[PDB]
Symmetry: T
Subunit: 70 residues, 12 copies
C-alpha cells in the first residue's frame, strides 16, 4: 500500500497440541509487542520427539507487519 515499507521478521511458534496452535501462539506473542501485523508465511514445520511422541510442534513463520514512520 502507498509507499508503505513492511518489515518481515522470522519466528518459530510452539505448541504441544499441533501445527495450527503453534502458529496461533507466535501470532499472539508477536501481537503483544508489534503493531500492524498483516500476513504470516510458514517457513518450516519441525518438532521435538520425546518418548516416541511429539512433544512440541515448532512452526517457523515470517511475520509481515507494516512499518510505522521513524
Amino acid at each position: 500500500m502507498s509507499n508503505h515499507t513492511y518489515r518481515v521478521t522470522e519466528v518459530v511458534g510452539t505448541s504441544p497440541d499441533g501445527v495450527d496452535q503453534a502458529v496461533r501462539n507466535a501470532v499472539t506473542r508477536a501481537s503483544q509487542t508489534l503493531r500492524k501485523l498483516d500476513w504470516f508465511e510458514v517457513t518450516q514445520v519441525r518438532g521435538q520427539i520425546e518418548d516416541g511422541q511429539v512433544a512440541h510442534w515448532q512452526v517457523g513463520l515470517k511475520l509481515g507487519f507494516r512499518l510505522e514512520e521513524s
Copy 2:
C-alpha cells in the same frame, strides 16, 4: 496410468479455523467443477492476521486430476 495425461492446476484454499479445513474447502470447491481429482500437494501455508489473530489460513495446493480425452 496407461498413457493418461494429468493436469496439475494451482489453487489457494482458505478457512478461518485451520490448515486442514483450508485444504478441505479447496478440494470441495475443486470437486464441484473438476472430475478425476487424484492427488494434492501443499505448495505454501500463509495467512492474514487481523487484530493480532489469524483471520484466515491460506494453504496453497497443486491439484492433480486425470485428463479426460478431448
Copy 3:
C-alpha cells in the same frame, strides 16, 4: 551432542483426519523399532483425493535419531 552421530531417515506419515495425526502415526510407528528419536522435519504435505474429498493426509518427514555405537 558430544561426538554423537545422528541418523536422518525419511518417511511419509498417513491419517484420514489430518496433517498432525499423519505426523503422530509415523512418529508412533517409528518409535516401535527406533530408539533416541529426537527431532522431525516436515518435507512435504501431499494427499489422496477420492470422491472430491481428502481420503489421506500424507506428510513427509525427516526423523532425526541419535545413533547408538556399533
Copy 4:
C-alpha cells in the same frame, strides 16, 4: 477471505521496453478475461537477445484471482 478459493494461474508477460512494462502487459491481458485479480508474484525474468540487444523482456508471473462460485 471467508472460505474463498483462489486460483493461481501462470503466465509470461512480454515488452520491448522493460521488466515492469512486461508485467503490466500480462496484467492488462489477464484482466480482459479474468475477474477478481488480486495479487501477482514474479517467478522468473528472462528475455530474448537479438543483435546484442534485449529484444523482449519476458517476466514470468503467478496471478492470484478470487474464484467465483461454480
Copy 5:
C-alpha cells in the same frame, strides 16, 4: 515476442516405456486442444512401481504456449 502474453500450464505426461515417450504423450495430448505450443520445461520425473518394475514414467512439465487475443 511483441507484447505477446504466454500461458504456462502444468501437466504430468505418462508412458510405460520411458521419460521421453511420457513427454511426447503429453505434448500430443496438449496439441489436440491447445494452439501455439512453443516450449516445455520438465518439472519432475516420478513413476509407479509394480512388481518391482517401473509400470509408468510420470514426467511433470510446464507447457508454454502463446496466448491468442481475447
Copy 6:
C-alpha cells in the same frame, strides 16, 4: 571486513510506479533509522492488482548493514 558482524534484516519495499522505485522507497526508509547500510538482495517481486492494473509493486529485500559494537 576485519571481524565485523553484519545484520541482514528483511523488508518489503513498495511503490505505485515500479520495481526499482519500490527498492528505493525501502532503502530510503531503512536509512532513516539504520546506519552502515552496505548491500541489498531482492528476495521476491510481488504486487497488488486492482481494477486489472498493478496498484503497488512489492519488492522483498534483504538489507545487509554493518553492526556497530555493543
Copy 7:
C-alpha cells in the same frame, strides 16, 4: 492409505546406455530386498565422462515403499 507409514529410501541407479535403464537397474536391485515398492522420484541426473563419452548414467532416486508392521 489407511494409517500406512511409507519409508522413502534414497539410491543412485546406474547404466552405460541411458537415464531410463539406470532407473530400471535400481528398481530391479531394490525389488530383490524390498517389498511394497510403490513410487520413485528422480532427485538428480549425473554421470561419469571417460574419453569424451558418457560412461555411466547416474540417476538419483527416492524409492517410496509401504512399511510392513514391526
Copy 8:
C-alpha cells in the same frame, strides 16, 4: 536447434539507474566479444547502498549463446 550446443555463461550486469539498464549494460558488454547471443535469465538482483541510497543495481544473468563448431 539441430544438434546445436549452447554455452550458458554467468555475469553480473551493473548500472546506477536500475535493474533494466544493468541487464542492458551486460548484454552490450557481452555482445562485444560473443556471437549468437540468444537468451538471458536473471539469477538475482542485488546492489550496493551508499549514504542510504542505491549506488549500483547488480543483476545476475545467465547468457545463453549458440556455440560455433570448434
Copy 9:
C-alpha cells in the same frame, strides 16, 4: 519447549582465518546483546578476495534464540 516463541535473526559472521572462526565471531558478538541463544544454521559461505587471496570469510547464519515474555 512449552509455548516458547523463538526469534530467528539473520547475521553474517566474519574472520580472516576461516569459516569456523567467522561463525564464532558472530556467536560471540550476538551473545553480548542477546540471551537464550539456542541454535545457529549456516545460510551461505561467501568471502572477499584481495590480491588473489581470501581476505575475509563471510558466513551467513540464522540465530535461533528463545523469546523472553514481553
Copy 10:
C-alpha cells in the same frame, strides 16, 4: 584429487530424438575442445515444440573437468 582445481562450465545439449542423445551431443562437442572431462550434472530438461511435437530436446548440463596447471 590431490590439490586439483576443477572447472564447472555450463552448456545446453540438443537433439531431435531425446534427452540422452542431447546429453551425448554436448559431451561430444565439449570433448573436441576440452580435456579431462570427468562428470556432468543435468541442470534442467526443456525443449521446443513445433506443430504439437517435440522438435528438440534441450538438456542443461554442468560439465566438471580437471584444470591443467597455468
Copy 11:
C-alpha cells in the same frame, strides 16, 4: 560404475571443534558398519549454542556408498 546401485544414507556428524571434524566423526562412525563408502555431500551446517559459544558443530551429510549384491 557398471550397473552398480549406490545407497545415499543421511546423517548429521558432530564435533565441539568445527565443521571439518564433525564431518570426520560421521565418516569414521559410518565406516565402522558400512563398506564401499565413496562420496559425501554436505546438506546443512547447524549447531548448538550454549553460554554464547558454539558447543557443537552439526554438519548434515549424504553418504554415497556402493551397494553389494543381495
Copy 12:
C-alpha cells in the same frame, strides 16, 4: 561499480586437509590466470571417501571477478 560487468565462473577447489584449504587452493589457482578477483560464494561441500576417511574436500565456488573492457 560504475557500469562494470562482472564474470561469475564456477570451480571446485580441493584439499586433503579441509573445507577452508580447498577454497584457498582454488582462489590461488584462479589468481594465476585471472585478474580483479573480488568475491567467492560456496555452492556446495562434497568430498571423496577412501578407506572410511575423507581423502579430499571438494568445495564448489562461484568466483566473481571484474571484467576488463574488450
